[PDB]
């Protein structure tokens, strides 16, 4: 709910337009975007190219890493700088198995061979990495390393600012739609946005555009609906902006049915990675049973995935769901037993690990430490409840939803290159349009280091694309004016119909952003495998979801906004609605249940490797308002075995 | 969600910018031109990231846990410096914990993005190598990965 | 969420006290309360007794019947005025079996032998009852008759007003606590309240007090959490006030674990009674399966309950819960097939029943007709989705939660008289304190007619009690002053701590009513068998609920209010919190699952007629802050066999 | 929830009392002394009972379905009389339905609570009989119910 203190209204025609001409436009200054800005600045010199970074908030703290992070989840370690060395083949195997068999191995292997360099740079720039007395990076699990990352974003932000220059970073500018080449229907030409600090419309003309807006949250109703509606596990700042603008432009999506359901400390959603992997904490149900033991047999039906090590995350969730359906909650993270075991009676050792335990929260999700404080929970004395949160759509974490992107020439097989007009690393099916971080699908487990790295990869590819293809996109001024009118339409609608009611938020001719968002969340929660149905859905529910989303989409044409802040909220809602539609259509198309634990198709309860071991890719044609789906069979690119 | 203490907030005296309004990743902090004091304009959209809290030069911002699940009384107070950050965690029951963690090993604003890197070349633009590679990776050569036979 | 336009603050010491002396005080001017006012006015003349009715809103439309009702759910018909005559023994059997074997038959038979007279008066007063060409009341099912009841409450309000007199009706006065006899810890002496229209504190001194506040809603998170948080099936106006004040006074509660889960049209919560019983509508899952038939086997384990006709309400719910757990939604009410089959090809007949279908909603829950209009659902063409709503605590409908009350001398067995110091009909265990309608437990299926009737019964008993016992309790002025301070404490707290934050609703030293309610709803939803867990719970969850409710109760001492409206909201919350605590403690005490479909204890999944065929009665001792429970074995009072 | 049309609301300033404020069962309708026009002070606590809508003499109040599940465009408008009520249901798609139902068979304010009843007596006070019984029940004798042997 939003109640503006005062109005801040503008009519499209009263708003000045600022035109910015650049070569490479990066939309989103989070981890992937900063990686793109950093790397782009390096290669751009070859052609004296201009690199521009646009961010809706402030790069110093914007995005998922605003609070910092307690670990870097992706560090292969090919030399032995950490407590544990790994191979690239083992990593690729790990990711494909976690995806229950479906991952673009060319893309995964590609960021994996580059990620360590990124991490080494982060340390060079000042990021304090946990080290053993011997000087080795402290491992959390097999693939992660612990860090003192409270200032993780500010440090990366500084690197990007130093690289591209502050004069090339536009902050507090919300991008809401892409612009296409009125010379070519399948080529990008820039994007449009508006400031959230003043009345100013932005028209960015560019030769290459890189989507780095992060994923999508708040599509589904959360487990807390009051103030805590704001306590989403994933970044509440990411609202599927890249997904919306890219799909509207005709860029194909992939694995959009693959959402991620995080199992975390209840309500506050504090991290469990360190507790499980580093502190060796056990999770037990209300009766003291360690369900990863009691539910192990139930994974036998998922051979060879169920017999993989580590066990696929969705299958871990599945074991949790079985416990929930049997009514064995609360589920507890026994931090008290973990700390006692690790300290071994050594009081000084206990004090040290106790500080580490709190840092794990204070460096990344303070709300969990605050929750403990408010509820008088001392981790050394009593356990904490844990639970799965509502679904989130992203491609950098454990979820792989995003755009179908091209891989490197040396790893991408012919099977995966067919839909790309131009073969440039991380480019979408739309020429000149790239996708990174959460926006790039089918290659998950990138996390902070991998997302920055993918941005680096796309940035070099963008410079290469520009110097090799030499594009010269022309924006359609007619479309731009149409978009400008659309941009401020909500404000004009508010002024035009507010007099129909004595209450600004109860009007028959319009809906405010928070009102449309509550509606979206209810629809997705109840029909798209949200918490309401313990992540279950079927053909009928999904079809009803499309009907309700259709009504909502039509009502978006009657959105109203009272100030710039709410105008941004209005467009963030629009972005989420289309992302939601894509998600529903993808879940409806795949007739199987490959990731039980993330979602269940009760009408197609089994995993089908005979007919569905393929990536589901889709394209939205705005002109015809039609969605087309295609199945791209998975092929093993890297050598490995279960 | 975050909230501003009127007694400590000075609407950011004569500085060039309003710290809280400038830093908030979700555009929640704003100034009430009348009172000349800041406030969270939409608390149910607050992620409780503590960015505003850490950047307020007057320490006029605190966080009150979401009412949905938070009993009254708890608080986490940061005092962020240049190389480390201190935290004080106060429990509803009076318990007080104090921690201090490193946050950076180098001076702020000291990053040289391409320090020691060779200049880019048109030839290098066509390879798979990123800036600083393969040197920054630490390996004896660009990492190779076995393709499926 | 509440955002007052401006402040309306008062300190206790500056608010004038108005003392009202009366003989019989009726708290709540709804159906049961109006029945008490009506009947009390008749008998009061015998002793020149004064009768006072206090209502927080306006009697003309206050309570559950604000929109009107489409039927009178309880009409026995002992002479043939309707399409179907019935016997009292058959009715008592029907209620006991629907309650899965547990009902105070002395109380049920008692209101049943009186209810028809009430219905006849309703018609005489102007209520239009549907009639056949032959002049018989049109039956819905076996026990209900259809009515054109849009003005049902206004008509009953007029009758009560004519009886007691307008000068004896206090409106817009919220009663928040009872007063007890200074010289007898188990006798009532009056009550205290405050106006919500002006600064005025009320002190009612009475010899007999009748609790008629309706049940409790909004204790649990609803299926819609935004604006629709206000769309509860049951009266959102009833917040468990009677339960709170009576339990605080030490009056014993009974069957408080027996909540009611209504199966209704989805989201709007329109009625299904007429559709099932009158229109012969079928309910089917997403695959056209009539689950009342496909899930018939699952009821065989319940003996003899599963073979009863009609099937007990909770078991009907159980069948649809099984469908929901299997993921077979949407569940549909096939109104289209019902109308087609009833009309039989006769277009004129179709038009008639079509109008009847819409009246069913427009006379009782307009929101459902509005939902149909907004979603373009024409009941003659497409079906409507249905679903069980969240739990409600009340004793007038299909739930029997309420106070343990005394029965009539000629029907109540000695087994049920043990806990009553004085044996007056409908008197609680606290002398001089009566409970009716939703407030009287263990005698459900009263509905509109039955609640008005129970009020009449208690009213006559109250006059008899006063004339026979000549009660003369004395209020404790010291307690009154302490209660006056507490009454306005929220306003004083707001004024005292508002300066700690620049935002009125984000303060570290207080919670506003809507904030405490969101918290209560989340606790109950997640741990007390709410919608979140498909109505399942266990000992561990219930124990955690008590821990969280303890934190909330403590925080109630830090409630704040910005105006009189919110001050009422503050006390409505206090009332709900204690009601919720009582509900949780009762569910924790009963170690069985007697009403699957209403709630399931996963740790005690079976119905236990060997050790739990008893009423669960509790008492809260405010001075010791202790709860005590006891089992009162059910005994069959009326002659009937399965 | 309910909302007031500014063009039709006159704040009941030509009446002895404010109709909507008086009737609302949840105390939501109140007057904005500034505009002298009513408004719903807490819409998320509105039960959509339509009491305010029916009692507004200016027909200035309507209901806009809860945003959580209501697409825009639908409406139910009543015109309540003395013996019947008329309803117009307008669908989002433009369809319009009209209904008319009876609401009362006697004049308003005509109820004589104890019409035909004998006076109460001390003897009667000790029986199980309520006012008007046993005859109002339709039987010459008080209904009997068989107690289990
Ligand atoms: C939210 C969150 C995330 C993680 C974790 C805990 C929590 C609580 N923990 S663990 O415990 O889970 O394990 C991690 C951990 O410890 N270690 C690790 O490496 N990664 C973790 N992640 C994952 C990483 O943080 C993640 O992979 C990367 O940040 C993804 O990067 P990117 O895809 O670039 O998203 P971003 O959020 O950083 O940035 C997006 C930017 O776009 C902006 N933006 C969005 N829409 C826009 C628009 N329309 N116009 C202009 N700008 C517009 C955003 O404002 C932001 O700046
Ligand atoms: C909400 C609802 C209820 C029903 C139904 C549909 C819907 C949508 N439909 S069907 O679907 O089931 O079918 C019914 C139907 O068709 N036929 C029928 O006979 N009964 C139905 N009910 C049931 C009856 O309405 C119910 O049994 C009776 O109204 C219960 O009477 P009572 O127990 O007296 O509750 P009330 O709500 O009428 O009145 C309570 C009063 O107390 C006031 N109050 C509350 N606390 C207060 C405070 N602290 N101090 C001062 N006054 C304070 C209230 O303002 C109200 O005036
Ligand atoms: N399927 C059913 N069989 C028998 N009685 C029902 C059924 N559905 C509802 N009733 C009921 O009829 C009345 C109106 O139902 P409802 O509106 O659902 O509250 C109540 O008296 C219930 O006992
Ligand atoms: N039980 C586990 N086994 C292997 N990896 C895990 C486990 N739990 C979490 N991880 C993960 O460790 C990281 C941080 O965990 P989380 O906070 O759960 O996101 C991610 O890289 C996950 O792959
Ligand atoms: N989401 C999850 N829910 C419950 N347990 C998990 C989850 N993710 C991982 N685990 C497991 O993490 C650890 C992996 O155990 P193991 O394979 O024995 O090394 C155990 O501590 C489990 O609790
Ligand atoms: S940064 Fe602090 S001092 Fe400055 S306006 Fe914000 S709260 Fe006030
Ligand atoms: S805690 Fe974070 S999200 Fe909340 S107001 Fe402050 S900076 Fe913004
Ligand atoms: S009853 Fe109607 S005219 Fe009167 S104040 Fe209310 S809305 Fe305005
Ligand atoms: S519709 Fe009913 S609950 Fe809503 S404001 Fe009007 S009278 Fe009040
Ligand atoms: Na029935």
In chain A, the residue whose alpha carbon lies closest to the alpha carbon of D11 is A502
Q: Name the DSSP letter for residue A604.
A: S
The CATH homologous superfamily to which domain A11-260+393-486+614-633 belongs is FAD/NAD(P)-binding domain (3.50.50.60)
Find the length of chain A: 642
Nearest to C363 by CA among C122, C68, C140: C68
**CB distance A335 to A383 below 8 Å:** yes
C120 carries an active-site annotation: no
Most C CBs within 10 A among B10, B72, B77, B91, hence the mutation to make, goes to: B72
What are the extents of the domains in chain D?
A: 1-66, 67-149
Task: Classify burial at B115, counting beta carbons within 10 Å of its beta carbon; exposed 0-12, middle 13-18, buried 19 or more.
Answer: exposed
Q: What are phi and psi of A466, to 5 degrees?
A: -65, -45
Annotate C483-550 with three-state secondary structure.
HHHHHHHHHHHHHHHHHHCCCCCCCCCCECHHHHHHHHHHHHHHHCCCHHHCCEECHHHHHHHHHHHH
State whether residue A372 is helix, strand or coil: helix
Q: Is there contact between D and B if contact means ≥3 C-beta pairs under 8 Å? A: no
Sheet arrangement for strand C169-170: C169-170, C51-54, C24-27, C208-211, C433-435
Nearest alpha-carbon partner for C98 in C316, C424, C278, C263 = C316
Q: Say yes or no: CB of residue B61 within 6 Å of ligand 7.
A: no
Q: How many cross-chain Cβ pairs, B to C, lie less than 8 Å apart?
A: 57
What Å distances lie between residue C433 and A517, C78, C104, C180, C246, CA to CA? Answer: 48, 32, 19, 10, 8
Q: At what angle do helices A564-589 and A513-527 cross, to 10 degrees?
A: 20
Pair of tokens at residue A270: 């504090």
- Gap between the Cα atoms of D99 and D89, Å rounded: 8
Give the residue among C312, C340, C325 at the shortest CA–CA distance from C96.
C312
Degrees to nearest 5, angle at CA C255 with C249 and C257: 100
The dihedrals phi and psi of A260, each to the nearest 5 degrees, come to: -125, 130
Q: What is the DSSP string of C394-443?
A: -SSSS---EE-----TTT--GGGTTT-SS--TTB-SSBTEEE-GGGB-S-
Q: How many angstroms separate the Cα of A156 from the Cα of each of A147, B15, C180, D122? A: 14, 25, 68, 91
Residue C148 host element (H or E):
strand C145-149
Measured distance CA(C509)–CA(C515) in Å, rounded: 13
Query: In C86-226, where does DSSP find H-type helix?
Result: 88-98, 105-124, 152-164
Nearest to C488 by CA among C202, C188, C169, C172: C202
> Which single residue is written with the structure tokens 């989507």?
A211
Q: What gap in Å lies between CA B66 and CA B44, rounded to an integer?
A: 8
- C140 has catalytic annotation: yes
Contact at CB, A533 and C3, closer than 8 angstroms: no
DSSP letters along A248-269, please?
HTTPPEESTT--B--EEETTT-
Contact C467, C46 (CB under 8 A): yes
Q: Residues within 5 Å of ion ligand 10 by Cβ?
A: C 141
What is the SS3 string spanning A109-173? HHHHHHHHHHHHHHHHCCCCECECCCCCECECCCCCEEEEECCHHHHHHHHHHHHHCHHHEECCE
Distance in angstroms (rounded) separating the CA atoms of residues A224 and A638: 43
Q: Phi and psi of A135, rounded to 5°?
A: 90, 10
Residues forming a β-bridge with A260: A392
Strand partners, C626: C621
Surface of A (518-547) touching C: CB under 8 A: 518-519, 522, 526, 531-534, 536-538, 540-541, 544
Task: Report the SS3 class of residue A10.
Answer: coil
What distance in Å separates the CA atoms of residue A358 and residue A625, rounded to the nearest whole number?
A: 51
Task: Compute the nearest-CA separation of B13 from chain A (Å).
Answer: 20
- Element (DSSP H or E) covering residue C25: strand C24-27
With CA atoms as reference, report the closest residue to A450 among A166, A30, A84.
Answer: A30
Cβ proximity of C51 and C44 under 8 Å: yes
Q: Are C459 and C24 in contact (CB under 8 A)?
A: yes
**The domains spanning A11-260+393-486+614-633 and A261-392 adopt the same CATH topology:** no
Helices A447-469 and A31-44 sit at what angle, rounded to 10 degrees?
A: 40
Helix, coil or strand: residue A459: helix
The residue written with tokens 């409450």 in the block is C153
The domain ranges of chain A are 11-260+393-486+614-633, 261-392, 487-607
The encoded tokens of residue A273 equal: 């990675």
Contact residues, C window 391-450, toward D, CB-based 8 Å cutoff: 408-411
* Strand partners of residue C126: none
Q: How many CA atoms lie within 13 A of D28 on its CB side?
A: 29
Minimal CA separation from D85 to chain A, in Å: 24
Per the CB < 8 A criterion, the answer to whether C391 and C529 are in contact is yes
Distance from C-alpha of A103 to C-alpha of A445, rounded to nearest angstrom: 10
DSSP classification of residue B9: -
Query: What distances in angstroms separate CA D96 from CA C59, C259, C350, one per listed residue?
Result: 34, 40, 17
Using DSSP's 3-state secondary structure scheme, residue A594 falls into coil
Judged by CB atoms closer than 8 Å, whether chains meet at B3 and C519 is answered as: no
Task: Quote the DSSP letter at residue C288.
Answer: S
Cβ-defined contact of B146 to A81 (cutoff 8 Å): no
* Separation of CA B42 from chain center: 20
Closest to A318 measured CA to CA, from A297, A337, A341: A297
* C625 burial level (CB within 10 Å; 0-12, 13-18, 19+): exposed
| Gap between the Cα atoms of C283 and C566, Å rounded | 41
Helix axes C513-527, C564-589, angle to 10 degrees: 20
> How many angstroms separate the CA atoms of A569 and C97, rounded?
54
* C-beta separation of D8 from D46 below 8 A: no
DSSP of A31-45: HHHHHHHHHHHHHHT
Q: 3-state DSSP call for residue B120?
A: coil
Phi and psi angles of residue A302, each rounded to the nearest 5 degrees, phi first: -100, 40
Tokens of B115: 């320090």
DSSP C139: B
Hey, what CATH topology would domain B67-149 get?
6.20.260
Nearest to C225 by CA among A533, A367, A528, A220: A220
Quick check: C327 contacting A, CB < 8 Å? yes
Beta bridge partner(s), residue C129: C147
Hey, is A8 helix, strand or coil?
Answer: coil
In CATH terms, the fold of domain C261-392 is Flavocytochrome C3; Chain A, domain 1 (3.90.700)
A459 Cβ partners below 8 Å, 6+ apart?
A24, A26, A35, A36, A37, A38, A39, A40, A43, A51, A210
Instruction: Decide: C513 and C2 in contact? Cβ < 8 Å.
Output: yes
**Beta-carbon-side half-sphere exposure of residue A276 (alpha carbons within 13 Å):** 19
How far is it, in rounded angstroms, from Cα C561 to Cα C574? 13
Q: Give the closest residue (by CA) to ligand 8 atom 3.
A: D9
CB B60 within 8 A of CB B5: yes
Report the pocket of ligand 8 as residue ranges, CB < 6 Å.
D 4, 9-12, 18-20, 38, 56, 58, 60-61
Which token pair is C562? 């910005």
Contact yes or no for C557/C569 (Cβ under 8 A): no
Q: What is the resolution of this structure in A?
A: 1.7
Q: Does D67 touch chain A (CB under 8 A)?
A: yes
CATH of domain B1-66: 3.30.70.20
Residue C186 contacts by C-beta under 8 Å, 6 or more apart in sequence? C180, C250, C421, C429, C430, C431
Beta-carbon count within 10 A of C62 CB? 29
If phi over 0 gives left and psi between -120 and 50 gives alpha, with beta otherwise, what is residue A358?
Answer: alpha
Q: What is the Cα–Cα distance from C254 to C439, expressed in whole angstroms?
A: 10
DSSP string, C317-330: HHHHHHHHHHT-PP
Residue A184's φ and ψ, nearest 5 degrees, are -150, 115
Query: Which tokens in the block code for residue A337?
Result: 């037993």
Strand order in the sheet with C384-388: C263-265, C384-388, C331-333, C283-284
For A22, list phi and psi in degrees, rounded to 5: -145, 175
Architecture of domain C487-607: Up-down Bundle (1.20)
Q: What is the spatial distance between Cα A176 and Cα A220, in angstroms, rounded to a whole number?
A: 21
In chain A, the largest separation of any two C-alpha atoms, in whole Å, equals: 74
**For residue A140, which of A455, A462, A356, A401 has the smallest C-alpha distance?**
A356
Put simply, the answer to whether B130 touches A378 (Cβ < 8 Å) is no
């Amino acid at each position: 709910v939003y109640y503006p203190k005062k109005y801040e209204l503008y009519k499209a025609d009263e708003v000045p337009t600022e035109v910015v001409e650049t070569d490479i436009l990066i939309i989103g200054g989070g981890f992937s975007g900063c990686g793109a800005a950093y790397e782009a600045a390096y290669w751009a010199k070859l052609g004296g190219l201009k690199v521009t970074l646009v961010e809706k908030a402030a790069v110093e703290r914007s995005g998922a890493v605003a609070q910092g992070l307690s670990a870097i989840n992706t560090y292969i370690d090919l030399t032995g700088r950490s407590e544990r060395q790994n191979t690239l083949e083992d990593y690729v195997r790990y990711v494909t198995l976690d995806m229950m068999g479906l991952a673009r191995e060319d893309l995964v292997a590609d960021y994996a061979r580059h990620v360590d360099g990124t991490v080494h740079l982060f340390e060079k720039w000042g990021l304090p990495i946990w080290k053993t007395p011997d000087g080795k990076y402290v491992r959390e699990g097999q693939w992660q390393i612990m860090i003192h990352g409270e200032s993780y974003k500010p440090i990366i932000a500084e690197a990007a600012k130093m690289a591209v220059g502050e004069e090339n970073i536009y902050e507090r500018v919300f991008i809401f739609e892409l612009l296409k080449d009125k010379n070519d229907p399948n080529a990008v030409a820039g994007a449009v946005g508006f400031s959230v600090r003043e009345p100013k419309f932005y028209v960015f003309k560019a030769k290459a555009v890189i989507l780095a807006t992060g994923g999508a949250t708040l599509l589904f109703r959360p487990r807390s609906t009051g103030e805590a509606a704001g306590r989403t596990w994933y970044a509440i700042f990411d609202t599927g902006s890249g997904y919306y603008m890219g799909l509207k432009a005709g860029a194909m999506l992939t694995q959009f049915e693959h959402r991620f359901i995080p199992f975390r400390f209840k309500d506050g959603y504090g991290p469990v990675g360190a507790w499980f992997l580093f502190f060796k904490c056990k999770a037990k149900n209300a009766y003291g049973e360690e369900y990863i033991k009691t539910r192990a047999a139930e994974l036998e039906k998922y051979k060879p995935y169920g017999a993989a090590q580590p066990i696929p995350t969705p299958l871990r969730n599945h074991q949790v769901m079985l416990e929930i359906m049997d009514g064995n909650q609360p589920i507890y993270m026994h931090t008290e037993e973990a700390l006692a075991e690790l300290a071994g009676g050594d009081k000084k050792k206990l004090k040290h690990i106790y500080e580490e335990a709190f840092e794990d929260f204070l460096d990344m999700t303070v709300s969990q430490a605050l929750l403990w404080a408010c509820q008088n929970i001392d981790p050394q004395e009593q356990p904490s409840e844990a639970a799965p949160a509502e679904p989130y759509i992203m491609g950098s974490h454990s979820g792989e939803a995003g755009f179908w992107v091209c891989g490197p020439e040396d790893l991408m097989p012919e099977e995966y290159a067919k839909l790309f007009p131009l073969k440039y690393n991380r480019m979408t099916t739309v020429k000149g349009l790239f996708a990174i971080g959460d926006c790039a699908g089918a290659n998950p487990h990138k996390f902070s280091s991998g997302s920055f790295t993918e941005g680096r990869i796309a940035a070099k590819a963008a410079v290469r694309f520009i110097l090799e293809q030499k594009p010269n996109p022309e924006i359609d001024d007619a479309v731009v004016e149409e978009l400008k009118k659309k941009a401020y339409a909500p404000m004009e609608r508010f002024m035009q119909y507010k007099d129909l009611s004595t209450a600004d938020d109860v009007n028959p001719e319009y809906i405010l952003p928070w009102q449309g968002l509550v509606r979206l969340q209810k629809i997705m929660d109840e029909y798209a495998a949200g918490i309401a149905t313990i992540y279950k859905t079927n053909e009928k529910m999904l079809q009803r979801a499309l009907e309700l989303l259709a009504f909502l989409k039509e009502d978006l044409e009657k959105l109203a906004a009272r100030d710039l802040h709410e105008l941004m909220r209005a467009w963030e809602l629009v972005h989420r609605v289309w992302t939601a539609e894509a998600h529903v259509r993808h879940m409806l198309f795949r007739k199987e249940t490959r990731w039980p634990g993330y979602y269940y198709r009760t009408d197609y309860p089994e995993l089908n490797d005979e007919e569905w071991k393929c990536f589901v890719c889709s394209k939205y044609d705005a002109e015809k308002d039609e969605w087309t789906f295609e199945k791209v069979p998975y092929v093993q690119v890297i050598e490995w075995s279960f | 969600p975050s909230f501003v203490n009127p007694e400590k907030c000075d609407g950011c005296k004569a500085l060039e910018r309003t710290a809280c309004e400038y830093i908030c990743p979700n555009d929640l902090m704003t100034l009430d031109k009348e009172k000349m004091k800041a406030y969270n304009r939409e608390p149910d959209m607050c992620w409780e990231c503590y960015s505003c809290v850490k950047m307020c030069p007057q320490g006029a911002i605190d966080v009150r846990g979401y009412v949905d699940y938070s009993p009254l009384g708890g608080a986490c107070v940061p005092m962020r410096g240049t190389s480390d950050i201190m935290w004080t965690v106060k429990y509803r029951n009076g318990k007080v914990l104090r921690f201090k963690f490193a946050i950076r090993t180098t001076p702020w604003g000291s990053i040289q993005p391409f320090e020691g890197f060779p200049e880019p070349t048109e030839e290098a633009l066509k390879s798979e190598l990123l800036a600083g590679e393969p040197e920054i990776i630490g390996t004896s050569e660009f990492p190779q990965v076995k393709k499926k036979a």
